[PDB]
């Protein structure tokens, strides 16, 4: 009995009109915060039922929520799509009661229920950031000449491939390697979005700071096969990759 | 001489009226000595005795000097129009954010 709905964003029309939704999607933390507030704590509704106070996340409750940023249902209208799921009841009249300019159509929600079998075909779209934890030589200053010390910095490098390998079967081999651990097996998958995803974060007289959030996103699509139905119920609403809370874990439950 | 406010016309010439000093013994009063029935000897009913009264003139700026204003006259209620470039503004603005 999972909670699947649709938020609908314009991303089009007259360029002269300032569209706050367009800058709302052009950052991770904005959509993250707005969908995180979309499950408010119950005592706030009893206290302020009108969404008319300076909020605080300590008053809010915390759940491993997750979304999906897509676009382009055609038919002579370019439009952008937000697909959200989590485990608690969301509210959309509470969330966007002052943000009617954010959307291009009123949101809609129905009841959806997923079922899985053994050795059954599926169709899926996932998004996982290309993340490989590596020891790197540090490279700072860069004032005319390179300067390094013996310290090896620890971070997650974006995925790279050898010069005799195209990106396509490299990410196919990544998905093939990650399949038997998570609980499925595929025969082929198609790469259709490899790119860079940028964002920024504020944090606590104090100031505010801007740092470029960095994620090597990978959105794929097409034809899934399963090995056991019991290895998929714990995958939905939790995520399979990294940047889990940032909207990188929705299992597209479309059996066809 | 105390100015009540900052830009008021002050008398350049300043009169002074004094009881007539007899000087030496004798010395009948000069021709400018006027009579004035203001020496009290009983006060219910008022009996007044005459006295000799003489006036000199003083000139301000050489023997009588002015004072400072020592206060404000107009009220002028408090100030609006907060600025947007001072350093005390940006710290509060960033703190509220």
């Amino acid at each position: 009995m999972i909670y699947l709905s649709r938020l609908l964003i314009d991303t089009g029309g007259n360029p002269d009109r300032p569209r706050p939704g367009r800058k709302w999607l052009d950052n991770i933390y904005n959509v993250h915060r707005r969908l995180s507030m979309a499950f408010p704590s119950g005592l706030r509704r009893e206290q302020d039922p009108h969404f008319l106070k300076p909020f605080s996340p300590n008053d809010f409750q915390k759940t491993p929520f997750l979304f999906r940023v897509d676009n382009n249902i055609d038919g002579n209208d370019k439009r952008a799509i937000i697909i959200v799921q989590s485990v608690l009841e969301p509210d959309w009249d509470y969330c966007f009661q002052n943000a009617l300019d954010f959307l291009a159509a009123p949101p809609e929600t129905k009841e959806y229920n997923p079922e899985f079998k053994a050795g059954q075909l599926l169709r899926f779209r996932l998004r996982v950031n290309a993340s490989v934890r590596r020891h790197i030589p540090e490279m700072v200053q860069q004032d005319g000449q390179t300067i390094e010390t013996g310290k090896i910095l620890h971070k997650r490098v974006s995925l790279t491939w050898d010069a005799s390998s195209t990106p396509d079967q490299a990410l196919a081999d990544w998905l093939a390697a990650k399949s038997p651990k998570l609980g499925f097996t595929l025969q082929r998958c198609e790469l259709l979005q490899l790119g860079w995803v940028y964002g920024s974060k504020p944090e606590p007289w104090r100031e505010h700071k801007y740092n470029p959030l960095r994620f090597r996103a990978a959105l794929l699509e097409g034809v899934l096969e399963v090995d056991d139905p019991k290895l998929f119920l714990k995958t939905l609403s939790s995520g399979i990759g990294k940047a889990k809370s940032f909207g990188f874990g929705l299992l597209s439950v479309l059996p066809i | 001489l105390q100015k009540r406010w900052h830009n008021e016309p002050l008398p350049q010439i300043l009169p002074c009226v004094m009881d007539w000093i007899p000087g030496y013994d004798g010395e009948h009063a000069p021709d400018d000595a006027e009579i004035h029935y203001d020496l009290p000897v009983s006060f219910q009913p008022p009996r007044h005795l005459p006295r000799f009264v003489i006036r000199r003139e003083l000139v301000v700026g050489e023997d009588v000097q002015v004072s400072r204003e020592t206060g404000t006259s107009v009220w002028r209620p408090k100030g609006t129009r907060a600025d947007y470039n001072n350093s005390e503004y940006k710290k509060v603005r960033a703190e509220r954010l």
Side-chain angles (χ1 to χ4, degrees), chain A residues 2-57 59-86 88-116 118-146 148-151 153-167 169-172 174-208 210-229 232-233 235-256, chain B residues 1-20 22-67 69-97:
Chain A
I2 50 56
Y3 294 168
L4 187 300
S5 61
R6 157 108 68 79
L7 292 174
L8 215 33
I9 300 307
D10 48 276
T11 67
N14 215 9
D16 210 40
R17 322 276 166 269
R19 291 180 242 138
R22 177 182 28 142
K23 323 71 199 173
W24 178 52
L25 330 179
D26 292 9
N27 156 291
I28 286 100
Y29 226 132
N30 302 144
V31 303
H32 185 297
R33 155 72 50 74
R34 187 50 47 260
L35 271 306
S36 75
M37 177 311 308
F39 333 104
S41 25
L43 79 187
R44 147 197 301 105
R45 340 168 68 80
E46 191 175 355
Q47 281 189 330
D48 198 1
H50 202 344
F51 198 31
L52 197 186
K53 57 108 167 173
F55 74 104
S56 316
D59 186 38
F60 281 102
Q61 85 103 345
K62 190 45 200 277
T63 326
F65 87 130
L66 200 148
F67 26 81
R68 193 145 274 241
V69 168
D70 276 27
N71 38 30
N72 288 36
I73 325 171
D74 293 28
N76 217 38
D77 39 341
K78 184 302 172 203
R79 270 224 325 290
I81 282 84
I82 294 308
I83 292 320
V84 62
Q85 84 298 343
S86 163
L88 66 153
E89 162 80 7
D91 39 7
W92 299 260
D93 83 76
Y94 203 170
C95 164
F96 292 128
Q97 66 98 17
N98 300 336
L100 301 323
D101 196 7
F102 275 7
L103 305 311
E108 58 287 352
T109 311
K110 72 270 190 163
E111 175 32 14
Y112 219 62
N113 255 283
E115 301 110 300
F116 287 118
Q120 208 247 353
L121 44 84
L122 221 74
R123 211 185 175 164
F124 77 134
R125 336 215 321 181
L126 259 291
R127 292 192 70 137
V128 174
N129 38 358
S131 47
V132 174
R133 178 79 42 147
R134 284 183 178 161
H135 269 340
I136 61 173
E138 68 148 347
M139 198 37 266
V140 289
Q141 194 64 264
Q142 290 100 2
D143 201 5
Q145 278 286 332
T146 168
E148 315 93 359
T149 79
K151 190 258 310 305
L153 186 280
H154 224 358
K155 61 99 156 186
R156 229 142 61 195
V157 186
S158 77
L159 155 76
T160 176
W161 36 87
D162 39 316
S164 161
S165 50
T166 212
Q169 95 314 344
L171 277 299
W174 182 309
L175 203 291
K178 203 173 250 72
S179 35
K181 174 151 294 314
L182 174 287
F184 71 102
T185 307
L186 80 151
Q187 84 280 70
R188 62 124 174 85
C189 206
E190 211 53 46
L191 215 34
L192 68 167
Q193 170 147 285
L194 225 36
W196 283 250
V197 170
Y198 277 106
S200 290
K201 51 167 193 72
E203 60 273 332
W205 280 94
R206 285 162 290 197
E207 314 92 321
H208 78 122
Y210 289 158
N211 49 90
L213 266 273
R214 254 311 300 154
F215 286 101
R216 183 88 139 129
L219 168 161
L220 68 185
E221 156 142 32
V223 184
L224 201 51
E225 293 82 21
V226 305
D227 287 347
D228 44 338
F232 267 37
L233 283 336
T235 62
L236 84 84
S237 79
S238 39
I240 79 181
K242 315 275 184 287
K244 298 249 172 17
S245 34
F246 276 6
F248 278 90
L250 175 288
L251 206 150
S252 328
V253 288
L254 268 311
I256 188 42
Chain B
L1 156 70
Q2 172 102 340
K3 274 213 312 292
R4 277 181 311 184
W5 43 302
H6 63 291
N7 198 313
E8 58 171 321
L10 287 201
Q12 264 329 308
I13 183 71
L14 178 130
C16 211
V17 154
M18 307 129 303
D19 227 350
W20 164 63
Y24 54 90
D25 231 351
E27 187 38 86
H28 285 350
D31 319 56
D32 293 355
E34 273 160 1
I35 211 58
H36 275 355
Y37 309 95
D38 52 347
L39 213 162
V41 88
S42 154
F43 222 155
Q44 183 194 243
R47 213 90 203 108
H48 295 84
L49 270 306
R51 86 173 165 141
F52 280 111
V53 159
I54 38 171
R55 25 192 79 85
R56 322 292 86 89
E57 316 328 346
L58 298 181
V59 30
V60 299
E62 64 145 51
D63 86 271
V64 165
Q65 75 311 9
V66 316
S67 304
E69 315 318 304
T70 73
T72 182
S73 323
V74 300
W75 174 51
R76 292 281 80 75
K78 314 301 203 282
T80 173
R81 195 235 171 255
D83 89 8
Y84 304 100
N85 41 23
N86 82 93
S87 287
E88 193 59 36
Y89 189 44
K90 72 185 30 50
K91 35 186 287 316
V92 188
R93 150 195 169 276
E95 209 274 343
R96 195 45 167 136
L97 287 179

